C-alpha cells in the first residue's frame, strides 16, 4: 500500500503524493499479476487428473 508506507497516515503528505500521478497503479498491478501467476503455477503442476 502506497499511502501508509510512503506517508505516515498524514494529510499534506497525501496531497503532495497525489501530484506524482500513477506511480502506484503501475506498482499495484505487477504484484497482483505475480500473485495470480503463483496461484496458477501450483494448479498447473498438480491438477493433472
Amino acid at each position: 500500500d502506497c499511502t501508509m508506507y510512503i506517508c505516515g497516515d498524514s494529510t499534506e503528505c497525501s496531497n503532495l503524493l497525489l501530484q506524482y500521478g500513477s506511480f502506484c497503479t503501475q506498482l499495484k498491478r505487477a504484484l497482483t499479476g505475480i500473485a495470480v501467476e503463483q496461484d496458477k503455477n501450483t494448479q498447473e503442476v498438480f491438477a493433472q487428473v
Partner: protein, 48 residues
C-alpha cells in the same frame, strides 16, 4: 467505489481491490514539560 478506482462504468466479474481501511483515532492527550517547582514571585511583588 470499484467503478471509481477503475475509471470505467462497466466492471466484469471477479475480485478487485478498492481503497484502504483505517480506524480514526478520537480525543487527544497533552503532556506538559515535566517541571513543577514554582517561581517565587511573592518576594519581588510583595516586599516590606
Amino acid at each position: 467505489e470499484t467503478k471509481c478506482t477503475l475509471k470505467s462504468f462497466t466492471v466484469e466479474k471477479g475480485i478487485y481491490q478498492t481503497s484502504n481501511f483505517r480506524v480514526q483515532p478520537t480525543e487527544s492527550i497533552v503532556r506538559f514539560p515535566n517541571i513543577t517547582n514554582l517561581c517565587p514571585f511573592d518576594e519581588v511583588f510583595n516586599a516590606t
